[PDB]
Design a protein around this ligand. Structure first.
Ligand SMILES: CCCCCCCCCCCCCCCCCC(=O)OC[C@H](COP(=O)([O-])OCC(O)COP(=O)([O-])OC[C@@H](COC(=O)CCCCCCCCCCCCCCCCC)OC(=O)CCCCCCCCCCCCCCCCC)OC(=O)CCCCCCCCCCCCCCCCC
Ligand SMILES: CCCCCCCCCCCCCCCCC[C@@H](O)O[C@H](CO[C@H](O)CCCCCCCCCCCCCCC)COP(=O)(O)OCC[N+](C)(C)C
Ligand SMILES: CCCCCCCC/C=C\CCCCCCCC(=O)O[C@H](COC(=O)CCCCCCC/C=C/CCCCCCCC)COP(=O)(O)OCCN
Lengths: 459, 57
């Protein structure tokens, strides 16, 4: 696993010793090379895992997340090149350093074989994100946003640490392989109930679960574009990966401890979706759509069936790519208009046709049009939920309809109709933006050809 | 025919020849508790190192 970790670390001296005008070029080229190297992790077995050493191991659940993490960095660099033009060289290097440190922490977190190691890196991912949000954010709300993003997270994760050390004093190990092979049932007890809550709440708060999601709209609308990309595409999936890993020691308590969350998700996905129908901010709408998709992922993980896990993995990957693309499109509008209000810039299909095509493809993917992998994950989750209880279809069905509505709403308000008369500064789209959208959208349609790569270890 | 002892003579530490047996436990002490086992041997490296959380050394 060090063949990926060491070059990512070498990105830092390469960034700092680079010329003043060559930081973006070198960073982009070497990040793309690291992504190409990390592509080799996709060769997985139907057997246990790729146990490289005592410290790191890879799975068909970890491999797609690692590939997505390594692929997101060049896109973030391209997206950040524009609005950081008038910034001093040292601060640009600091920005790139924050992005590299985030990538390193994520890489290690996904492959860590120890629960405590996983916790440490899972928390280490907070500092770069907080600095990025509160330093290079634009509005004055960013400070408050950062505070929320911090304390919510910590409020969930401090109990987990306690539980973790408690577990290691009882079983004697926190290694995931030993934990899986030596699993024992959890008896119905108040102590076991609180241990379950401590092990679950930290991952619930970062999905985010409905009712614990208030930090996400603030953080995503106040972050810079690269921060929004990494928050929506990768940092949300940390909770899903953690819950997928930790549910092996929580049975059979999950059979009845999952009821409050399942409801909170199944109703919650409705509410957030309906919230998207009445929203005046593009980024806020995209963030709430992320909340709805992650509620579906929460349901999938709590159901605890093979089809549920396959659908959850596929949906996590698909949502990461789609939400990153949508945030990039919204930002490409914002850098022209400087408003972030949906109804200001209108009728943009007439002025920017290719960007309108990108908007259409992104909206179609978010709408879960078959055979996209978004729909593959959604349909597998829906089938598993139907087996769990035939009534669930109702709520699931409703969500589907609502989703389409707001997706097309966002497409119709910004792209169709008449152009705004007084807005005369809408320049032709640059090659950088078009390439960014193409590099977002081509991997999705390529992945629909080999879905087994993103279906997780239960395929 | 008595001769007065001189200076420094009555403060001498003398010796006494007695048939009284020497007491063996004048303090009436009980049996002293046995000491701790006092383990000893050759030092070997710790098995798998510190074994602290995720550290392999
Ligand atoms: C259908 C068969 C096709 C076979 C031929 C090859 C097709 C190649 C497709 C390549 C992949 C999509 C590329 C998207 C980026 C486009 C980049 C671009 O800007 O081009 C401008 C270029 C130049 O135009 P311009 O003058 O600059 O345009 C000015 C304006 O922008 C005006 O622009 P515009 O108005 O022309 O906009 C572009 C146009 C077209 O643009 C798009 O919409 C692209 C995205 C469409 C799909 C959206 C995601 C849906 C989920 C797809 C998952 C499957 C992926 C399969 C593998 C893909 C690998 C990449 O918009 C539409 O027509 C709406 C498309 C709605 C499609 C609905 C049906 C989708 C599912 C169909 C079934 C597929 C599986 C069948 C399975 C059963 C039978 C085997 O025009 C084009 O190249 C258009 C291409 C024609 C559309 C292809 C749609 C079919 C292909 C779908 C994916 C591949 C399927 C392969 C199996 C086929 C059997
Ligand atoms: C705010 C936004 C959302 C945040 C996330 C919310 C999710 C957290 C919800 C917690 C899950 C439920 C916790 C406990 C569930 C166990 C089942 C139990 O509560 O039901 C009955 C228990 O009866 C009563 O519930 C007893 C407890 C009553 C007092 C608890 C407070 C009730 C409402 C408090 C809600 C406050 C939540 C927010 C805190 C800040 C069952 O009867 P009994 O067979 O006897 O007990 C079985 C358990 N045994 C085997 C260990 C004995
Ligand atoms: C986003 C905000 C969320 C905040 C976190 C919510 C989760 C809270 C979970 C409980 C907190 C403490 C967890 C305990 C760590 C696990 C260790 C464990 O399970 O050991 C138990 C100990 O369990 C406890 O002691 C837990 C008691 C609770 C004390 C702290 C109360 C915290 C608040 C409780 C109510 C809120 C919980 C749900 C909140 C929902 C989200 C708001 C057994 O102890 P023993 O005595 O050794 O064994 C018994 C046989 N002799």
């Amino acid at each position: 696993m060090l063949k990926i970790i060491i070059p990512t670390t070498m990105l830092l001296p390469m960034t700092w010793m680079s010329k003043h005008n060559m930081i973006w070029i070198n960073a982009t080229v070497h990040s793309l090379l690291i992504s190409l190297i990390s592509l080799s992790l996709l060769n997985q077995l139907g057997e246990n895992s790729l146990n490289f050493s005592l410290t790191f191991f890879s799975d068909s659940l970890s491999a797609p997340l690692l590939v997505l993490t390594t692929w997101l960095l060049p896109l973030m660099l391209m997206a950040s090149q524009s609005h950081l033009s008038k910034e001093t060289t040292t601060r640009k290097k600091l920005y790139i350093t924050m992005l590299i440190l985030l990538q390193l922490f994520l890489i290690m977190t996904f492959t860590a074989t120890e629960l405590i190691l996983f916790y440490i890196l899972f928390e280490a991912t907070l500092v770069p994100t907080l600095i990025i949000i509160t330093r290079w954010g634009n509005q004055t709300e960013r400070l408050n946003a950062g505070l929320y993003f911090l304390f919510y997270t910590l409020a969930g994760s401090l109990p987990l640490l306690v539980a973790l050390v408690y577990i290691q004093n009882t079983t004697g190990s926190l290694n995931f392989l030993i934990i899986h092979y030596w699993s024992h049932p959890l008896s119905n007890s108040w102590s076991n109930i609180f241990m379950w809550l401590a092990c679950i709440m930290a991952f619930m708060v970062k999905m985010p679960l409905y009712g614990l999601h208030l930090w996400l709209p603030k953080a995503h609308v106040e972050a810079p574009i690269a921060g929004s990309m990494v928050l929506a595409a990768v940092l949300l999936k940390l909770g899903g990966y953690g819950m997928m890993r930790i549910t092996t020691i929580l049975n059979p308590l999950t059979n009845y401890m999952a009821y409050p969350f399942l409801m909170l998700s199944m109703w919650g996905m409705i509410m957030t979706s309906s919230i998207c129908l009445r929203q005046t901010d593009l980024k806020s709408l995209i963030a709430y759509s992320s909340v709805s998709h992650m509620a579906l992922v929460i349901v999938a993980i709590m159901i605890q069936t093979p089809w549920s896990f396959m659908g959850a993995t596929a949906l996590m990957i698909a949502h990461g790519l789609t939400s990153s693309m949508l945030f990039c499109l919204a930002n490409t509008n914002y850098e022209r208009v400087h408003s972030r209000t949906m109804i200001l810039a209108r009728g943009l299909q007439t002025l920017l046709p290719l960007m309108a095509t990108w908007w259409l493809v992104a909206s179609l993917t978010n709408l879960a049009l078959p055979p996209s992998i978004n729909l593959i994950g959604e349909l597998f989750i829906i089938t598993a939920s139907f087996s769990w209880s035939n009534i669930t279809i109702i709520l699931m069905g409703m969500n589907m309809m609502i989703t389409a509505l707001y997706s097309l709403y966002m497409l119709i308000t910004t792209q169709r109709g008449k152009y705004t008369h007084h807005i005369n500064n809408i320049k032709p789209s640059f090659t950088r933006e078009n390439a960014l959208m193409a590099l977002h959208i081509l991997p999705l349609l390529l992945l629909t050809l080999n879905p087994k790569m993103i279906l997780g270890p239960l395929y | 025919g008595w001769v007065r002892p001189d200076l420094g003579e009555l403060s001498k530490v003398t010796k006494v020849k007695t048939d009284r047996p020497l007491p063996e436990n004048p303090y009436h002490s009980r049996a002293r508790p046995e000491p701790n086992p006092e383990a000893e041997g050759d030092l070997k490296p710790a098995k798998h190192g510190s074994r602290l959380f995720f550290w392999t050394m």
